[PDB]
Amino acid sequence: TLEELRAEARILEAKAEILKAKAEVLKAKAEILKAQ
Amino acid sequence: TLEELRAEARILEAKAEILKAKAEVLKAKAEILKAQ
Amino acid sequence: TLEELRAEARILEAKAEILKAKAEVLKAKAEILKAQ
Amino acid sequence: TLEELRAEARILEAKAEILKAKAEVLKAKAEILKAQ
Amino acid sequence: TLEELRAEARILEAKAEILKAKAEVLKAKAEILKAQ
Amino acid sequence: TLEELRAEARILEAKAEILKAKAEVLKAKAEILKAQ
Amino acid sequence: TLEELRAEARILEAKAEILKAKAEVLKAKAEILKAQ
Amino acid sequence: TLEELRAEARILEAKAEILKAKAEVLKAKAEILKAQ
Amino acid sequence: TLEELRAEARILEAKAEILKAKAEVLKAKAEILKAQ
Amino acid sequence: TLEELRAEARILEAKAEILKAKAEVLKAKAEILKAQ
Amino acid sequence: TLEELRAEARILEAKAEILKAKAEVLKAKAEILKAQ
Amino acid sequence: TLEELRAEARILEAKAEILKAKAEVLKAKAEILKAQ
Amino acid sequence: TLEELRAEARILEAKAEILKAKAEVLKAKAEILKAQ
Amino acid sequence: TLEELRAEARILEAKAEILKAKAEVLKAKAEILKAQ
Amino acid sequence: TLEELRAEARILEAKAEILKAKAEVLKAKAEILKAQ
Amino acid sequence: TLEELRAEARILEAKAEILKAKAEVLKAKAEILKAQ
Amino acid sequence: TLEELRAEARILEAKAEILKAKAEVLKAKAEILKAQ
Amino acid sequence: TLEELRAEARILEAKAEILKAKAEVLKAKAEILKAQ
Amino acid sequence: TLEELRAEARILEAKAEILKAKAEVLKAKAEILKAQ
Amino acid sequence: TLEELRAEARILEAKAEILKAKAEVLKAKAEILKAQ
Amino acid sequence: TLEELRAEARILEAKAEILKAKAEVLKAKAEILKAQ
Amino acid sequence: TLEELRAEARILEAKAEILKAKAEVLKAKAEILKAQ
Amino acid sequence: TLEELRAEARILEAKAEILKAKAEVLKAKAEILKAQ
Amino acid sequence: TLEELRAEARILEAKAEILKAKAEVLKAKAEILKAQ
Amino acid sequence: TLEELRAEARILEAKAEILKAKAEVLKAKAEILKAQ
Amino acid sequence: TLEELRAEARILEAKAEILKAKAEVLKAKAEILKAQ
Amino acid sequence: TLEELRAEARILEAKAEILKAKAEVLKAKAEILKAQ
Amino acid sequence: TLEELRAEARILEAKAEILKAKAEVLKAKAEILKAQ
Amino acid sequence: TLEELRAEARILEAKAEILKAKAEVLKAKAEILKAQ
Amino acid sequence: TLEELRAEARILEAKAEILKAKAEVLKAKAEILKAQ
Amino acid sequence: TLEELRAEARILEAKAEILKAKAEVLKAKAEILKAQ
Amino acid sequence: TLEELRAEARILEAKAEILKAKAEVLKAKAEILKAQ
Amino acid sequence: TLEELRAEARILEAKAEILKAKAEVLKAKAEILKAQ
Amino acid sequence: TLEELRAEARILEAKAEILKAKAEVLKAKAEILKAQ
Amino acid sequence: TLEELRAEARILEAKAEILKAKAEVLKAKAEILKAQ
Amino acid sequence: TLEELRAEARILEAKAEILKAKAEVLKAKAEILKAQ
Amino acid sequence: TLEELRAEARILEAKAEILKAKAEVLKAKAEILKAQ
Amino acid sequence: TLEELRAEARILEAKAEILKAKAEVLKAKAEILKAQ
Amino acid sequence: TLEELRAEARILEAKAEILKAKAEVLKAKAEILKAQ
Amino acid sequence: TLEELRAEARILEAKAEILKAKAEVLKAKAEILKAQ
Amino acid sequence: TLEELRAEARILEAKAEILKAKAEVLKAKAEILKAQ
């Protein structure tokens, strides 16, 4: 269970990181919208 | 129990971080809505 | 009991943080509702 | 008793913080209700 | 007795803070009831 | 006696503050009863 | 005696303040009884 | 004697204030008895 | 003597004020006795 | 003598005021005796 | 002499006022004797 | 399951990195739009 | 599946790197636009 | 499929490198534009 | 009986006050009849 | 009966206040009739 | 019935307040008629 | 009915406030008429 | 009906606020008329 | 209708704010007229 | 209509802000007139 | 119209900012006038 | 028009920044006038 | 016109930066005047 | 004109940088004046 | 003119760098003055 | 003139570098003064 | 003059390098002073 | 004529008030003549 | 004429107020003459 | 003439206020003469 | 003349304020003379 | 003369403020004399 | 004279501030005298 | 004289600040005396 | 004298800072006395 | 004297810093006393 | 004396730094006490 | 003495660094206690 | 003694470094505990 | 002793390095645990 919960931590750690780079697409998306 | 509660802390630590990047999707979502 | 109460502190520390990021979902939720 | 009362302080310190983030859920809950 | 009364102060300091956040639950509770 | 009376002041200072936040629970309790 | 009477003033100063917040519990107690 | 009488003034100044808040407990005590 | 009589004035000024708040305890004491 | 008589006026001014609040204790004393 | 007689007026002005509040002690003294 | 979840972590780790360099295309895209 | 998912990781690792050097073309593209 | 995906990795690895040296043409292109 | 007679006083106290404001309707009723 | 008579006092207290503001409509009604 | 009569008090309390501000419209209405 | 009458109180509370600011328009209306 | 009356409260709350700032235009309007 | 009335609240909320800053133009307008 | 009224809110939000900085020009305008 | 009103918001957002820095010229203008 | 208004935003964004550094010349101008 | 206005932005961006470093000469100019 | 204005930007970019290092001479000039 | 202004940029770029290393002589000059 | 100014740049480039190594003599000069 | 200034650059390039190795004598001089 | 007669009332209202404060100068004029 | 007579009222309103404070100088003038 | 008479009102408004604070100097002047 | 009389108002406004704080020196001057 | 009278206002504005803080020295001077 | 009077203002501005912090020494001086 | 008076301002500015931190020693001095 | 008074400012600037950190020793000194 | 007073400043600057880190020992000393 | 006082500064500079890292031992000491 | 005090500085400099790495053992010690 | 104290520095320098790498064993020890 | 302490330094220098490579075994140990 211990390493399993360590693994269940490990999969949920990854799911945040996709949403992090999802925001950074939207971050420079506005940077196009202001540099013009 | 001790390392188990340490693990039950560890899984609940991860569940916050998905909601953190969930907000940051919505953060730059408005930044598109103002840079236009 | 001491480290146990330290652990019972430690689990209750985590339960606040989910509610913190729960509010920040609702924080930028209104920010969509004003940037439009 | 001293560190025990220090620990009994420490558990009661945590119980306030859940109620703090409980209010902040309700804080941005009205912020949805005004940004619309 | 001195540090003991300092500790008996310290436990009674914590008991106020739960009631403080207890009110702030009720504070934003009415804020839902007016933002609608 | 001096620091002892200073400590006996210090414990009695705390006992007021619980009653202060006890009233503020009842303060916003009526605020629910009028915002509806 | 001087600082002692200053301290005997200081303890009796605290005893009023508990009764002050004791009244303010009863103050908003009637405010529930009229907001309904 | 001068600062002593100033101190004997200072202790007797405090004894009035407990009776002041003693009346204000009784003040809002009737306010419960009329708001019902 | 001058500042001494000024101080003997100052202590006798305080002794009236305890009797003032002594009456105001009795003032709202009858106010309980009529609001019922 | 002038400021001295001004001071002898000043101490005798205070002695009236204790008797003033002495009457007002007796004033509301009858007010208890009629509100019942 | 002029300001002196003004001061001798000023001390004799105070001596009336003690007798004024002396009567008002006796004024409410009968008011106890009739409210019963 | 453990190495499998380690592998399911490993594929989801890669999917973030494409979106990271996707933003950096848009990052220097605005840098053309300001250096002119 | 394991080495297959390792391979499906391996192809998706390459697709990021083309976009990385795609940005660096645009990086020095603005550097021409400022060195003049 | 495995060595095929290894080969499909291998062709896509090459396509990045042309764009890498494409940028380095533009890198020293500005270096002419500043050394003059 | 005592608090009951205090209550029977309390209801009869209210019945006067309706007649008081009943007269004050008629008071300004003539004030219309003279300001014209 | 006691709190009931307290409530029957409480409803009859309200009925006076409508008649109070009823007069004050008529109060400024004549004030229009004299300021012209 | 008790809280109901408390509520029937509470609705009749509101009906006075509209008439209060109704008079204050007429109050400053004459104040226009005299400041000219 | 209770919360309904609480709501019927709540709508009638609002209708006074428009008339309050209606008077304050007329309040400063005369203040123009006197500052000239 | 409840949230509807809460909404009918909510629209009537807004209509007062325009009249509030309508008065404050007239408030500083006289302040021009006196600072000259 | 509910979100529509929430929107009809939302447009009427904005119309007050223009009048607020309209007054503050007139506020510092007199401040020029007194600093000279 | 909803996002349209959200947009009609959004344009009227901007019109206040020009008047805000219009006042702050006049704010420091008097600050020149007093620092001399 | 939507992005157009978003653009009409966007131009009116800029017009405030010139007036903001217009005030800050006048802000340090008085700071010269006091540092001397 | 859209990118044109985006450009008309972009030129007006620059005009604020000259005035920003114009103030900061005046900011340290007083800092010379106080460090002496 | 678009890239031209982008260029007219680009020249006006540079003119601020000379004034920025102009202030920072004056910034450390006072720092000599206080370190002595 | 475009690359010319880009060049006229480019010469004015250089003139700021001499003044930047001009300040940093004065920056460490005071640092000698405080390390002694 | 273009490459000439590029050259006039290029000579003025060099003149800053002598002043940069001029400061760094003074930078370690104080470092002798503090390491002793 | 062009290559001449390129040469006049080239001689002034060298004069900075002597001062750079002049500082680095003083840099390790303090390093003797602290390693002892 | 051109190759002459190139030569006058070339002699001044050498004079820095003696001072560079002059510092490196002092560099390892402290390294003796710390390895002991 | 109506507002004119209202204005002719308004000027004649002011002429009384100067004579009112004219008497109050003479009122305290005798109060000097008796306090001496 | 109307606003002119309103202004001729307005100047004559001010002339009374100087005489009002003229009397109050004489009011406390006798209060010095009796407190001595 | 109108704003001139408004200004002639404005200067005569100021002349009263000096005499107002002139009396208040004399007001507390006697308060020194009685507190002694 | 208008702004001149506005300025002659402005200097005479200041002369009152020195006398205001002149009285408040004398105000707390007696407060020393009674607190002793 | 105008800015001169503005300056003669400005010096006389400062002379009041020294007397203001002169009183506040005497204000807390009595506060020492009563807290003992 | 103008900047001189500005300077004579500037020195007299400083003399108040020493007296301000002079009072605040005496402010917390009594705070020692009551916290004991 | 001008920079001299600026310097005489500058030395007198420093003398206040020692007294400011002198009070703050006494500020937390009582905070020890109450936390016990 | 000028740099000397600048130096006499500079030594008196340092003497405040020791007293600042002297208070902060006493600041956390009470923080030990409350965290127990 | 100048560099000497600069040195006497420099030694007194160091004496504050020991007391600064003396407080920070006591700062985290309480942090042990609350984390338990 | 100068370099000697510079050295006496230099030894006292070191004595603070041991106490700095002494606190940081205690800093992470509590961090063990909360991470469990 | 000078180099001796420089050496006595040098030994005391080393004693801090052992305590620095002593804390960093305890720093990652808690990092084990949270990563589990 | 000098080189001896330099040597006693040199041995104590080594004892820190073992504890540094002792922590870094524990540093990556937790990194195993999170990468799983 | 000197070379002996140099040797006792030299053996203790080696004991750190085994622990350094001991950590680096554990460093890449987790790198296996993440590359899968």
Residue numbers in the entry:
A (entry chain U), B (entry chain O), C (entry chain I), D (entry chain C), E (entry chain D), F (entry chain J), ...: 1 to 36
In the authors' words:
Here we report seven high-resolution cryo-EM structures of filamentous peptide nanotubes based on a cross-α supramolecular architecture that provide insight into the designability of helical peptide filaments. A structural interaction is identified based on an appropriately placed pair of arginine residues (RxxxR) within the corresponding peptide sequences. This local interaction motif, designated as an arginine clasp, is robust within the context of these cross-α assemblies and can guide the coalescence of helical protofilaments into structurally defined cross-α nanotubes. In contrast to most structurally characterized filaments based on synthetic α-helical coiled-coils, the chain axes of the helical protomers are oriented in a plane nearly perpendicular to the long axis of the assembly.
In a control experiment, a second computational optimization was performed in which positions 6, 7, 10, and 36 were constrained to those in the original peptide sequence. The arginine residues at positions 6 and 10 defined the RxxxR motif, while residues at positions 7 and 36 (Ala and Gln, respectively) appeared to be important for organizing this motif. A comparison between the two sequences, 36-31-3_LL and 36-31-3_RR, could provide additional insight into importance of structural preservation of the arginine clasp interaction. The computationally designed peptides, 36-31-3_LL and 36-31-3_RR, displayed an α-helical conformation and formed high aspect-ratio filaments of similar width to those of 36-31-3. In contrast, 36-31-3_RR filaments persisted over weeks in solution. The differences in stability between the two computationally designed filaments suggested that the cohesive interactions were much weaker in the absence of the arginine clasp interaction. In order to confirm that the arginine clasp was conserved, filaments of 36-31-3_RR were analyzed by cryo-EM. A 4.5-Å resolution reconstruction of the 36-31-3_RR filaments displayed a nearly identical structure to that of the original 36-31-3 filaments, with very slight differences in the rise (2.49 versus 2.51 Å/subunit) and the rotation (124.5 versus 124.0 degrees/subunit) for the respective 1-start helices of the 3D models. Accordingly, repeating the statistical analysis of this assembly’s RxxxR motif produced very similar results as for the original 36-31-3 filament, indicating the native rarity of the geometry.
